[PDB]
């Protein structure tokens, strides 16, 4: 029923004479939000080491074809929300029947730039039992007499035009000579000379010299030409096969190459199992020495499709990247499953004032505006996932929970729910930011959440222990409390954490629904309407993204109000069935102030 | 004699009518130098704190026309090597008979950009007694029926275009009506919300509401409406003129309109005496509390300007920028000019492996490659500036100087010279570099030096967070030059923070080195070059190609091979043409990719 525009997706073939300015979906597969500089990381797990990365490859989309460019009317969505716990994000994708060569949706790019991840697309070139072809792998390795590879400047301009940064090359099509070994060699080295300063290109330990596929789940002799070959640069990084028992060997040839053991990334099989995965981890992670490599994790989204609802992906998503503590600080080192936080610092891009969270978790089964539901219908859109907490979950005091609620939310579709028992004159905090913004005049902290039970809920700030006051200005809005607390009187600190705090009262329950936190006018936007080619009898409207704006509200009007239809964090967006009414579309400026509303008829 | 490309220059009709495919000269005036995010500050003057900004509007080209797009075969060029105590650079240009809206030349965004500092252009409404004209200024103030201003447009385009980070918008002409006024600031809004983000407009303290021209060198009630009006934000900054003794006002006034006190820019004209200005430094840093405002500073190119010479000019700016002590750690806060060492921090962009230096300053008599000479003829280049040392200059033992030397050079035309006496047995260390290098496995520390008295030199190293003096590993001579590799491997996982150099006199008791490479951290596939004609100059060509730093361009000659030209961006200009040439890549560690052959 879907005829908008889609995320692209490729055979050899097609992507050759793909052309941006020809492909109607191609300006609905920009990204327009740049990938955030400089994480900051956190040192509340004593165990956790600065040496090792780790890479995701997840399926953020279930499918390859068939996905809308800027979100779609469905709540049950691959959200991931441990961005930061991941150094490399690989968007999995790619099939015999549907495309090789895979670009991230807008949505997720986005999601990820946010957090400061790089995301790489996916070049797959699948094993025969699954209509894999040597030939698409040939067509790929086309040279011309120039040296250079046209396909090879595709996957470039893709990353360029799209917004990404990078690719991962998934090399396991038999049936390639040592010929066709050294083709790749010179595809992945011509890649390396015309990539842009960042831009990463993460290879796949399969194919080796031979060309036979042979995965080594280490390095070694077979295939480290494929990473560094003497002084010339092959690939920034090798993604190692699974069945390995120790990284040793791997660290030491590494160095002896003259690279990083940390390009290397120890490959555990996660897809079937999630945390219930055997793993030897004292084999990448030894006991009083660093780790021999960095860590790459095949089908973190088992959190996802092992799941029926968004209740049990978030649990199994908390239970794999932080552990069965439900504390990244207090971790198991002799679980099976300890868990990421057991051994990666949690870096925060909370690092840049203003900073500004609505606990938007990039889905919901409903749509609110200053706390009020402007559209009962389910959506996700991963382009207003916000940055969120650092730490999942730490508390001291009470008997109390913290997770994420699609019951409440003041923007969006979600909130941070903090509920449970508290006893009268007991206190209870929070901590959820890893933070660095710099105070200055004129700075102040906001915070808005509702509560069930009246206890007042305070903030929480730790600057270059937390102080924890009262805001100093109430304000109500729809239902919710928006506190404001002038931090004039620290202009020239650093605030390094955030967190809230609450004291129990008579009732002996807390239950809180926190909707906005934040650290820190737009023009009402220029519209045009346009043909959507691919579909009349749709639309798309267009304007000039303003570097301003966080994103774009498109209001129809109706009998019952004012209804939100679409949003998009981009410069267009495109509403089905519009050529069969008038339209409000306002811009949210970072701060989530928002615009007057274009009127569109 | 010069019929190159030119840095551009326009009055507001022809901007309006500027378009970068149709000029000739355009592709010439591009930077291909990316601002270097994330500088890191050093700690080594007490009293510099870290509130208040500096801006340096200088004329880094003494005229504004008759500019060369990418360098000329000029020694004495305005090689400014301060941009560690700069936060903003303002190209200063524009005039009545050249033209008033002027961004700066690629040479100089370049090396700006280099070390993190963010480079405008500049919008230039005259004085009438200098020409001015108000039909320029309402010509930059049309407005469509859109209501968005089209030459507002055009200073968006040109500064994305060629690769800077907005403008100083300078407005004096008299003549202004309070709707001029209005227009203006409806201008500067509009450049708000169309420009990306990071870009800069930058707003001289000079036409009030009312649309006179009165300077309140303060922010007041009479100039706050071109900075913030209520919610709506109509400036990044605002440019103090200079007639103020105190800032404690403005600072007040900026709280309650709810900016930082620190986007405004207190003005000292330094143009005519430099060091020997007068300030009242009280009034804009006291004694405790902190700055009341960030720091302006009018025309820093007086230490070129009143120069004959590039020693006295690289003397004047050590003494502007550092002070009298010729140390930046050790400044006088009671001398007359205790230079802005003294109040600001100095910042680095060493701060990403690899790390390379060759104390390149931008200009030479001579040019060199591995240490031999390959022309002899003057040159300035400005984006084959290197990142220069943090600190000038932190020594400690020994009777000895730093300074640069363009007598002599292993890659460009000057080396860092420490040189005077050193007694046998003792020791000496100049600290350089403030950094943030994060070490790993096969990242190697090389430097390469000569030494006039055969001692040996040394390497400093501080780790995050006293350096570490160590002795190279591997010696390699080359053409005179001794080339220490030390590797680092012992120390990945590691962050330096901090480069030096140390020697030990012998029974010669002179030191004299001059060092022409350090650095910390594959050779470039040979150009693909193809011959374009250079449409203004026939007879004339260009070079134009497609990781690399810089492209250098060699003429076959009776007495070898010949440097005629270097390149930072995608093509060169080369006069006379009508004949072998020989084109090179180097990379960012100035290892050369194998020359393409043009005949
Ligand atoms: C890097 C790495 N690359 C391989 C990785 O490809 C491999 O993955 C597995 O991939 C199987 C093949 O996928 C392709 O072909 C299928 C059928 O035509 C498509 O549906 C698919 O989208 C691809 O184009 C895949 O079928 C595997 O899934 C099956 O087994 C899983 C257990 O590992 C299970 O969880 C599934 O639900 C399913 O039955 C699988 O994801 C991995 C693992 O073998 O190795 C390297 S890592
Ligand atoms: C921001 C700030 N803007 C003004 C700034 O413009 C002003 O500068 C002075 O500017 C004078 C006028 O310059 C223009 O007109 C000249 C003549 O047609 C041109 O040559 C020029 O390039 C411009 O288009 C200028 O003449 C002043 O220089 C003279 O006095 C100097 C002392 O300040 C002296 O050092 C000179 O050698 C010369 O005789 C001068 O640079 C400043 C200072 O008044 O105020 C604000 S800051």
Same mark, same amino acid.
Request: hydrophobic share 40%.
């Given at each position: 029923t879907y005829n908008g525009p889609l995320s692209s997706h490729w055979f050899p073939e097609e992507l050759a004479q793909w052309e941006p300015d020809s492909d109607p979906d191609a300006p609905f597969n920009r990204s327009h939000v740049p990938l955030e500089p400089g994480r900051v990381a956190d040192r509340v797990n004593a165990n956790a080491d600065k040496d090792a990365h780790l890479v995701s490859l997840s399926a953020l989309n279930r499918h390859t074809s068939g996905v809308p460019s800027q979100g779609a009317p469905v709540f049950y969505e691959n959200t991931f929300s441990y961005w930061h716990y991941t150094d490399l994000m690989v968007y999995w994708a790619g099939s015999a029947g549907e495309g090789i060569i895979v670009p991230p949706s807008a949505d997720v790019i986005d999601a990820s730039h946010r957090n400061g991840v790089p995301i790489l697309g996916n070049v797959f070139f699948p094993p025969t039992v699954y209509g894999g072809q040597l030939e698409w792998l040939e067509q790929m390795l086309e040279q011309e007499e120039d040296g250079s590879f046209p396909l090879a400047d595709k996957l470039l301009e893709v990353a360029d035009y799209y917004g990404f940064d990078g690719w991962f090359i998934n090399q396991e099509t038999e049936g390639a000579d040592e010929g066709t070994a050294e083709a790749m060699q010179a595809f992945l080295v011509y890649l390396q000379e015309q990539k842009p300063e960042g831009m990463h290109i993460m290879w796949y330990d399969s194919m080796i010299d031979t060309g036979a596929? *042979?995965? %080594?789940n280490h390095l070694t002799d077979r295939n480290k030409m494929y990473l560094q070959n003497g002084s010339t640069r092959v690939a920034d990084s090798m993604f190692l096969n699974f069945?390995?028992?120790?990284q040793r060997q791997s660290n030491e040839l590494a160095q002896a190459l003259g690279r990083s053991p940390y390009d290397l990334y120890a490959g555990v099989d996660?897809? *079937?199992?999630?945390?219930s995965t055997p793993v030897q981890w004292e084999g990448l992670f030894p006991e009083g020495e660093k780790a021999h490599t960095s860590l790459g994790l095949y089908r973190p989204d088992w959190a996802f499709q092992s799941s029926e609802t968004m209740e049990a992906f978030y649990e199994k998503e908390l239970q794999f990247w932080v552990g069965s503590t439900g504390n990244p600080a207090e971790t198991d080192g002799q679980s099976n499953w300890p868990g990421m936080a057991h051994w990666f610092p949690a870096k925060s891009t909370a690092t840049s004032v203003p900073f500004v969270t609505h606990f938007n978790t990039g889905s919901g089964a409903q749509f609110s505006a200053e706390g009020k539901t402007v559209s009962e219908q389910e959506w996700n859109n991963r382009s207003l996932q916000d940055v969120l907490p650092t730490w999942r979950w730490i508390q001291h005091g009470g008997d109390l929970e913290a997770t994420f609620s699609w019951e409440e939310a003041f923007e969006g579709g979600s909130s941070l729910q903090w509920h449970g028992s508290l006893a009268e004159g007991e206190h209870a905090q929070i901590e959820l930011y890893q933070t660095e913004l710099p105070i200055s005049e004129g700075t102040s902290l906001t915070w808005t959440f509702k509560s069930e039970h009246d206890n007042d809920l305070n903030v929480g700030f730790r600057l270059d222990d937390f102080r924890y006051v009262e805001g100093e200005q109430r304000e109500s809005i729809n239902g919710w409390t928006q506190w404001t607390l002038p931090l004039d009187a620290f202009a020239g600190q650093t605030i390094t954490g955030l967190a809230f705090a609450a004291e129990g009262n008579e009732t002996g329950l807390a239950e809180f629904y926190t909707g906005q936190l934040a650290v820190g006018k737009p023009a009402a936007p220029n519209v045009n309407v346009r043909q959507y080619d691919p579909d009349p009898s749709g639309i798309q409207l267009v304007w000039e993204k %303003?570097?301003?704006?966080?994103h774009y509200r498109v209001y129809k009007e109706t009998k019952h109000g004012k209804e939100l239809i679409g949003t998009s964090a981009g410069d267009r967006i495109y509403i089905e069935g519009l050529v069969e009414v008038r339209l409000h579309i306002e811009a949210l400026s970072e701060t989530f102030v928002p615009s007057d509303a274009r009127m569109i008829d």
């Open positions: 596929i *042979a995965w %080594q069945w390995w028992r120790d996660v897809e *079937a199992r999630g945390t %303003q570097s301003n704006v966080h």
